[PDB]
Amino acid sequence: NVELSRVAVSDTHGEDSPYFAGWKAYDENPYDESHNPSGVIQMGLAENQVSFDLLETYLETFRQAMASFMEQIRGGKARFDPDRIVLTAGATAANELLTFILADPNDALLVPTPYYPGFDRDLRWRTGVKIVPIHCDSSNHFQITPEALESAYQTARDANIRVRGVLITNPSNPLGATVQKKVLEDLLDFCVRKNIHLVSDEIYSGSVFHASEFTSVAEIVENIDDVSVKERVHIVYSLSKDLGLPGFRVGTIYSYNDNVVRTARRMSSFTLVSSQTQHMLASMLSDEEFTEKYIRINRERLRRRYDTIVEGLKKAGIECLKGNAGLFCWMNLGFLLEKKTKDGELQLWDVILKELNLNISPGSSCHCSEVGWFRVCFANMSENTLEIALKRIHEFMDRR
Amino acid sequence: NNNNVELSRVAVSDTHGEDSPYFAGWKAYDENPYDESHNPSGVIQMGLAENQVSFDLLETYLTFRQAMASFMEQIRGGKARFDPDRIVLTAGATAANELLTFILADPNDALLVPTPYYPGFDRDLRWRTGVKIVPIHCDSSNHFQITPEALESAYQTARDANIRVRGVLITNPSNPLGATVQKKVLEDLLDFCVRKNIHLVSDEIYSGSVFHASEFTSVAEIVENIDDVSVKERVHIVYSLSKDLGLPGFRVGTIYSYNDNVVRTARRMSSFTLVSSQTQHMLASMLSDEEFTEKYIRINRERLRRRYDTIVEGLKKAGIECLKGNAGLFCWMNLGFLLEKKTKDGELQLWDVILKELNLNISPGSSCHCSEVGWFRVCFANMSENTLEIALKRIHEFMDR
Ligand SMILES: Cc1ncc(COP(=O)(O)O)c(C/N=C(\C=C\OCCN)C(=O)O)c1O
Ligand SMILES: Cc1ncc(COP(=O)(O)O)c(C/N=C(\C=C\OCCN)C(=O)O)c1O
């Protein structure tokens, strides 16, 4: 019999986590308004369909379009030379691709907790790079401290792991929260001192609720004119989340480093975007009058939905983190828990899954330093399916 | 200052292959590309193996795994069954080949690959994966086909130098040779793989472009009859739409693997290189349609064949003998005894005269790792009727002087 590679038989792909085991129970009997109203409702998949009718109602080289549409998201606060854009088949493809370019097998990336539980696959699986978690907690809304960067750096060098860059998510999945200007430039400054790359995964940037509150790492870069420090940062964007077009698989790497783009271009061979979809999204994304209209209404709609989910959970006795972005909220069932530990979280999540019939991302899958938090998505469902889901959790709390 | 950021070994590695002749030709092509009206004296591209001879049929025409399975069945002529549940879509074949290599081999382990091969394997297989290639050596003494003795030879090479070997990756039909592999050598190679306990990977990307349906033998043909699960799970097939359909920008390649354990790892690993669902949706009905895919593949086979005929007949009455080919989008022509120095440097110097003086891009055999000096791949399917007769008349009147 034939063996396969270490990588092949490695269980770093992550299909044993809670995250997936939820998706499996969802399919066992998915919710349906007419035909299965007691069925399980999906709130663990961070997808955006609240603004889809606008694209749908629309449709009755391409780098330039992608550059505009990025400019429009950031509000002329960035310039984006279409010649540095490198198309890759989704962000998951961009993040991995960068990691090959930015780190050796066994070297590391610092990643603030909580993070996208899917990084455990993307960054690690084929690349051989490790993650060292930068530890963050609810004492400051889970934001990156200059001391917790140093702490997590020392962790790596304590164990002979070279560190090669830090990969934040801006705005943060799962926190649903922008990072403040002041912490970005603080982090960039950390990167020149340690001589590493800053990777910004700006995938939720059209889904930040108020345009003024979002600070892209592009904002902190084309003003500071040292080529040495410019070439550390790189931006990873995709259409998957803002446009809600995740199956079209268009992500990009915009990198402020001449040497990356041309390696990233050659490396894109392995993960190209279908030219047919490039062609057919070109005019739309290029069209200022539309992208302006779209992003304004998307911001609002996502915001207005966030409001109803936290108000719902408020008058049922659940306080969420003060969020201003993303397609989800980061709700606290800390002091609403049995055992106050990791096993207690996984046991509570199994009651939510089996009894509420409700899929929710548990904080332990996100590597949260703190026990008892949960990501609940809201943008992959109707108005009505949310009020059902809220009424399900409202009347679960009644039984206390 | 002096506080500059390094990149990875892989990043600064020159295994991406943009120093070869292959690319340096593409760069001189752009300097002034050929154009019938605008500028004919311009350089003609015969180094890019692309198919546009049968495109007007798709143009005049216009889950999804089921379509891809049918279309593959139609290419092989019901000689394969293809469970759509084993198909794993990847963004092109270059993405499939790499993806498999991660699944089939560790960093520093090897793959045996018969020479000559797609010079782009030097990137695909090696670059991110850390695997090496050991060439299986083939020569014109038997039309560059794989011998059981040259497999053993190239295996020993690896084990001589402590390189574990993990599978062999043939191209069927062969790029650049333009030539099918015979049934007898495939099953001979499959037998080699059970004895050494390795995988056989078949890159069947040119399979709709083999000229006569009866002459092509897929590794799928040699497998669903032999019913040992042990030996079945060694082979894997890599196909794409890029070359037969001539739809290379839509980036749809697939891995069909006869190994339960691969498909589910290959599926999870496809995350990194997915096919746009929009193109999947819009190619679905077409590829599913038997009446059309039958008609298409018959005419494509013929058209590619009829073009091959004119290119070798052209080169014949100008004194160039090509290899007897029956497939692909190219021919493997011999300028061995039509050369100055008879060595690698002599080939690269001859190719620079063809590029600068003929104004003609042609893949030199040295880029393809050919064991033998002086051969060249010349593509023909990425150009009109007329641009070929110009290119032929250019080489005809070079031989005159
Ligand atoms: C920060 C971040 N980066 C990248 C991606 C990948 O998206 P791409 O452009 O490659 O489609 C996601 C999607 N994360 C959500 C997952 C979506 O579906 C994939 C399922 N694992 C989630 O639930 O957090 C994300 O949240
Ligand atoms: C054996 C083999 N494998 C893989 C590929 C990659 O094709 P994909 O399915 O990824 O589109 C090619 C095409 N090789 C040609 C390259 C074509 O370039 C495409 C330009 N976009 C060549 O010149 O040899 C090939 O001959």
Side-chain angles (χ1 to χ4, degrees):
Chain A
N1 271 314
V2 225
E3 301 200 325
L4 310 190
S5 51
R6 306 284 59 73
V7 35
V9 307
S10 175
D11 262 86
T12 50
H13 48 46
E15 199 149 25
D16 285 61
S17 184
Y19 187 109
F20 280 87
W23 168 75
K24 304 195 188 212
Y26 171 76
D27 280 68
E28 297 259 282
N29 69 314
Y31 173 95
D32 195 277
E33 292 201 351
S34 267
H35 305 272
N36 194 6
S38 58
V40 36
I41 295 166
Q42 181 66 282
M43 307 189 126
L45 254 294
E47 232 64 47
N48 182 355
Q49 34 160 99
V50 309
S51 300
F52 191 74
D53 72 319
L54 267 66
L55 285 335
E56 182 183 282
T57 206
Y58 190 91
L59 299 174
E60 293 85 279
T61 55
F62 160 96
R63 279 156 300 113
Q64 218 143 55
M66 185 64 57
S68 179
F69 180 62
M70 285 169 73
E71 288 163 21
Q72 190 79 62
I73 273 158
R74 279 161 200 74
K77 291 215 153 177
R79 297 290 78 191
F80 287 124
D81 190 4
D83 299 23
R84 335 211 74 187
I85 291 181
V86 188
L87 304 182
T88 66
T92 53
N95 287 308
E96 198 197 48
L97 196 146
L98 270 179
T99 305
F100 277 114
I101 295 167
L102 297 184
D104 282 333
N106 299 307
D107 294 356
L109 293 181
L110 309 113
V111 179
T113 77
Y115 57 78
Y116 167 41
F119 284 138
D120 292 313
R121 185 231 298 286
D122 298 344
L123 307 179
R124 280 160 56 192
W125 190 15
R126 308 204 293 194
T127 65
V129 317
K130 289 197 197 63
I131 294 170
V132 311
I134 308 165
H135 287 293
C136 318
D137 60 337
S138 63
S139 74
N140 72 321
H141 311 310
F142 302 85
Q143 284 309 308
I144 300 80
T145 75
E147 26 276 318
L149 269 151
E150 281 296 339
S151 205
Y153 187 86
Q154 283 307 318
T155 284
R157 305 290 316 109
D158 273 10
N160 293 57
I161 302 308
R162 186 178 169 172
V163 218
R164 295 216 62 165
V166 27
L167 180 134
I168 85 299
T169 316
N170 173 38
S172 185
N173 167 260
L175 292 151
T178 55
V179 306
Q180 305 88 66
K181 187 180 198 309
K182 46 142 282 160
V183 306
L184 289 177
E185 34 161 47
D186 185 311
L187 204 167
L188 189 133
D189 191 9
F190 176 87
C191 290
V192 314
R193 285 153 38 209
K194 298 295 193 288
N195 204 336
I196 65 177
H197 310 268
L198 189 170
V199 178
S200 194
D201 192 331
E202 314 215 326
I203 193 178
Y204 290 108
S205 50
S207 307
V208 61
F209 303 159
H210 302 99
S212 57
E213 297 191 305
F214 176 58
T215 303
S216 183
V217 307
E219 196 180 312
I220 77 165
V221 168
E222 90 299 72
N223 63 314
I224 199 66
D225 213 18
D226 189 1
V227 68
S228 169
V229 317
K230 232 176 179 187
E231 71 172 28
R232 287 166 159 71
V233 324
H234 330 272
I235 292 166
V236 169
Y237 183 56
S238 98
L239 273 31
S240 303
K241 296 307 182 293
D242 324 71
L243 250 59
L245 249 60
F248 286 26
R249 308 256 68 236
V250 25
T252 74
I253 291 162
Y254 193 89
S255 165
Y256 289 85
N257 180 308
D258 280 36
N259 240 64
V260 165
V261 319
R262 66 203 200 73
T263 311
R265 241 186 274 289
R266 292 159 174 162
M267 203 161 289
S268 64
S269 285
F270 302 117
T271 187
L272 247 309
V273 180
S274 149
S275 71
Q276 187 198 74
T277 95
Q278 287 181 238
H279 191 278
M280 88 87 57
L281 299 180
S283 69
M284 187 219 280
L285 299 181
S286 273
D287 176 11
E288 262 92 31
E289 99 186 332
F290 178 69
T291 55
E292 203 264 75
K293 171 168 171 290
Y294 177 81
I295 289 159
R296 189 184 60 248
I297 294 157
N298 189 49
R299 288 187 154 126
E300 188 225 336
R301 286 174 170 184
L302 290 160
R303 179 272 219 291
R304 203 206 316 137
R305 182 150 296 182
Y306 173 85
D307 283 344
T308 63
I309 225 277
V310 316
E311 184 84 338
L313 292 167
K314 261 175 173 299
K315 67 211 172 170
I318 322 283
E319 232 218 56
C320 294
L321 172 72
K322 62 210 292 154
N324 67 337
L327 315 177
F328 34 74
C329 54
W330 183 235
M331 80 166 187
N332 196 347
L333 308 182
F335 282 93
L336 292 87
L337 188 62
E338 37 164 13
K339 301 301 290 187
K340 183 190 183 69
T341 49
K342 197 162 284 143
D343 281 317
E345 197 183 293
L346 178 70
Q347 282 173 344
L348 173 61
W349 167 83
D350 211 75
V351 171
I352 290 170
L353 189 67
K354 302 260 85 71
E355 316 309 287
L356 277 316
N357 263 20
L358 207 79
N359 188 24
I360 246 96
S361 247
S364 55
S365 67
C366 296
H367 291 265
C368 188
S369 68
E370 216 161 286
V371 55
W373 297 86
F374 287 88
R375 192 193 72 188
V376 35
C377 310
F378 53 66
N380 55 341
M381 80 190 66
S382 74
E383 270 265 70
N384 282 37
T385 51
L386 186 50
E387 296 154 37
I388 291 286
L390 280 165
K391 198 164 94 297
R392 265 108 150 292
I393 181 153
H394 206 292
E395 76 197 2
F396 160 79
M397 301 314 304
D398 281 346
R399 314 188 299 274
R400 290 288 123 170
Chain B
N1 199 12
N2 311 140
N3 214 285
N4 267 315
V5 224
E6 303 198 328
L7 309 190
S8 50
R9 306 284 59 73
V10 35
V12 308
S13 174
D14 261 86
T15 50
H16 47 46
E18 199 149 25
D19 284 60
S20 185
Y22 187 109
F23 279 86
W26 168 76
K27 305 195 188 211
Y29 171 76
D30 279 66
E31 297 260 282
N32 68 314
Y34 172 95
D35 196 280
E36 218 133 59
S37 191
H38 245 216
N39 150 45
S41 69
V43 37
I44 295 166
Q45 182 66 282
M46 307 188 126
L48 254 294
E50 232 64 48
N51 181 357
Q52 34 160 98
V53 309
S54 300
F55 191 75
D56 72 319
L57 267 67
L58 285 335
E59 183 183 283
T60 205
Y61 192 89
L62 301 160
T63 56
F64 160 96
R65 279 156 300 113
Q66 218 143 53
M68 184 64 57
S70 180
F71 180 61
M72 283 169 74
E73 289 163 20
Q74 190 79 62
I75 274 158
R76 279 161 200 74
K79 291 215 153 177
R81 297 289 78 190
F82 287 124
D83 189 6
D85 298 25
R86 336 210 74 185
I87 290 181
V88 188
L89 304 181
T90 66
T94 53
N97 286 308
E98 199 196 47
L99 196 147
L100 271 178
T101 304
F102 277 115
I103 294 167
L104 296 184
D106 282 334
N108 299 308
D109 295 354
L111 293 181
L112 309 113
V113 179
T115 78
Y117 57 76
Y118 168 41
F121 283 139
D122 292 313
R123 185 231 298 286
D124 299 343
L125 308 179
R126 280 160 58 192
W127 192 15
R128 307 204 293 196
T129 64
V131 317
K132 291 196 198 63
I133 294 170
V134 311
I136 308 165
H137 287 293
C138 318
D139 59 337
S140 63
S141 73
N142 72 321
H143 311 310
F144 301 86
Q145 284 309 309
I146 300 80
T147 74
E149 26 275 318
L151 270 151
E152 280 296 339
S153 204
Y155 187 86
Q156 283 308 317
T157 284
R159 306 290 316 108
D160 272 9
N162 292 57
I163 302 308
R164 184 178 169 173
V165 217
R166 295 216 62 165
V168 27
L169 180 135
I170 85 299
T171 317
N172 173 36
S174 185
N175 167 261
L177 293 152
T180 55
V181 306
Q182 305 88 65
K183 186 180 198 309
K184 47 142 281 160
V185 306
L186 289 177
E187 33 161 46
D188 186 311
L189 204 168
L190 190 133
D191 192 9
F192 176 87
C193 290
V194 314
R195 285 153 38 209
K196 297 295 193 288
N197 204 335
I198 66 176
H199 310 268
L200 188 170
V201 177
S202 195
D203 193 331
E204 314 215 325
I205 194 178
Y206 290 109
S207 50
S209 307
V210 62
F211 304 158
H212 302 99
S214 57
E215 297 190 306
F216 176 59
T217 304
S218 183
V219 308
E221 195 181 312
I222 77 164
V223 168
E224 90 299 73
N225 63 313
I226 199 66
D227 211 18
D228 188 1
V229 67
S230 170
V231 316
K232 232 176 179 187
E233 71 173 27
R234 287 166 160 71
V235 324
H236 329 270
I237 291 167
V238 168
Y239 183 56
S240 98
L241 274 31
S242 303
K243 296 307 182 292
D244 324 72
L245 250 59
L247 249 61
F250 287 21
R251 318 255 59 244
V252 24
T254 74
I255 290 162
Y256 194 89
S257 165
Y258 289 91
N259 181 309
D260 280 37
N261 240 65
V262 165
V263 318
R264 66 204 200 74
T265 310
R267 240 186 274 289
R268 292 159 174 161
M269 203 161 289
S270 65
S271 286
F272 302 118
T273 186
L274 246 309
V275 181
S276 148
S277 72
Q278 187 197 74
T279 95
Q280 287 181 236
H281 190 277
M282 89 87 57
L283 299 180
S285 71
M286 188 218 280
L287 298 181
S288 273
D289 175 11
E290 262 93 30
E291 100 185 332
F292 178 68
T293 56
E294 203 264 75
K295 172 168 171 290
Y296 176 81
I297 289 159
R298 189 183 60 248
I299 294 158
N300 188 48
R301 288 186 154 128
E302 189 225 337
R303 286 174 169 184
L304 291 161
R305 179 273 219 292
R306 203 206 316 137
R307 182 150 296 182
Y308 172 85
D309 284 343
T310 63
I311 225 278
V312 316
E313 183 84 340
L315 293 168
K316 261 175 173 299
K317 67 211 172 171
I320 322 283
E321 4 139 277
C322 293
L323 173 72
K324 62 210 292 154
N326 66 337
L329 315 177
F330 34 75
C331 54
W332 183 235
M333 79 167 188
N334 195 347
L335 308 182
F337 233 135
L338 292 87
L339 189 62
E340 37 164 13
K341 299 296 183 181
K342 63 177 172 61
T343 49
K344 197 163 284 143
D345 279 318
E347 197 183 294
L348 178 70
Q349 282 174 343
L350 173 61
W351 168 83
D352 211 75
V353 171
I354 291 169
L355 190 67
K356 301 261 85 70
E357 315 309 286
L358 277 316
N359 264 16
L360 207 79
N361 188 23
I362 246 96
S363 247
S366 53
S367 67
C368 295
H369 283 60
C370 189
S371 68
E372 217 160 288
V373 54
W375 297 86
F376 287 87
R377 193 194 72 187
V378 34
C379 312
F380 52 67
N382 55 343
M383 79 190 66
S384 75
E385 269 266 69
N386 282 37
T387 53
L388 186 49
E389 296 154 37
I390 292 286
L392 280 165
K393 197 165 93 297
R394 266 109 150 292
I395 181 152
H396 206 292
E397 76 197 1
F398 161 79
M399 300 314 304
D400 281 346
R401 304 190 300 281

